[PDB]
Amino acid sequence: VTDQLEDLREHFKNTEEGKALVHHYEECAERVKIQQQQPGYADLEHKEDCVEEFFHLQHYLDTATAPRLFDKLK
Amino acid sequence: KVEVNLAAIPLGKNVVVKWQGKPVFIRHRTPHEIQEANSVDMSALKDPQTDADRVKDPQWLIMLGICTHLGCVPIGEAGDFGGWFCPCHGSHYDISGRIRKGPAPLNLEIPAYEFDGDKVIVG
């Protein structure tokens, strides 16, 4: 059994706005790598991260992975 | 009187312990952090005090986690001063445990303590 939720999160990541938003994070996840190889990074002090992205994604997921999810369940 | 295992405290770890019904704060201070504390303007300060008086060895910050406003217990590694924030009425404390922003009139109190081996007797 493909997890009733995992499966539902998947299907929604792969709609229009899912694509649009998984990307937005990737663009950021890449940008992070780039900033990390650099010298004296550990003393950059204001190091970017992509939690703000991440959360914008789950919100889109949640908003759909919630009123739907529960009927797949027992 | 109580006694802490100083070795069991990583460099940059906040440790709380039960003494006299209050909490006692012990941070293991990094040298960058030690510098922040002692490189500051005692006129930008409400209850102005030299970090080196507040501490015996600068590597060890040791104080009663009672917010000198109306006596809550400040959240660690918090605030706008690399110290502590008190969620009760927003008093901000710095990395030497002293008052920067907020209603608190005073710097987080320093208990009596003696070092001994790596055991500090907080009484």
Binding site: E6, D49, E53, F54, F55, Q58, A66, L73 | -
Partner: protein, 199 residues
């Protein structure tokens, strides 16, 4: 407040009991107890719930008498003045995994696993937030978030750094009735069971 310190808002799943006319799903509660027994009991006390209280809700009189006696509570001293054990009675409170606060932390990198009996009320969102923290352990701590040694990431916890590692991994519980022992079905139940426990 940064959305990272707050934790992400758990969504409005549609529970069996939500609504003014809705009894719990007792079948669901029954499952959660197993999901409770096999999984989280390893670490978590449920001290304000008594064996008898299960009877008529999730189980039947013996069904709970059985569970009850699988544990040796303390019992009044013999004629000499020396201890003794004894099995449980229905009159008892489901024993914690640990003998005190310390061994609870020793067994968890110095974390104090919350007694669960009251969890669905001692948290905002509650049923949802319980479900979501349990089905919301994502694979990796988001680009840039640097996680301490022995701590996991969760968007639904505040500041993600949760001292509880993920614990739902499909099928690790053998659902006695015979339901998809998933993780979003292992979870939805212990939530409905933990709901009961606090209310």
């Amino acid at each position: 407040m940064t959305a990272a310190e707050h934790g992400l808002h758990a969504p409005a799943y549609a529970w069996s009991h939500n609504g003014p006319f809705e009894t719990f799903d007792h079948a669901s509660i029954r499952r959660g107890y197993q999901v409770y027994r096999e999984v989280c009991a390893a670490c978590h006390s449920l001290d304000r719930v008594a064996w008898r209280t299960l009877v008529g809700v999730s189980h039947t009189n013996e069904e709970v008498r059985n569970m009850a006696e699988e544990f040796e509570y303390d019992d009044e001293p013999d004629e000499q003045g020396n201890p003794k054990k004894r099995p449980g009675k229905l009159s008892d409170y489901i024993p914690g995994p640990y003998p005190n606060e310390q061994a609870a932390r020793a067994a968890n990198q110095g974390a104090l696993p919350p007694d669960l009996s009251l969890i669905v009320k001692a948290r905002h969102g509650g049923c949802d937030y319980i479900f979501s923290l349990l089905t919301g352990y994502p694979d990796e701590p988001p680009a840039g978030v640097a996680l301490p040694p022995g701590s996991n990431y969760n968007p639904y916890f505040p500041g993600g750094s949760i001292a509880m590692a993920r614990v739902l991994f499909d099928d690790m519980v053998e659902y006695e009735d015979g339901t998809p022992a998933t993780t979003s079905q292992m979870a939805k139940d212990v939530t409905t069971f933990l709901n009961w426990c606090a209310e």
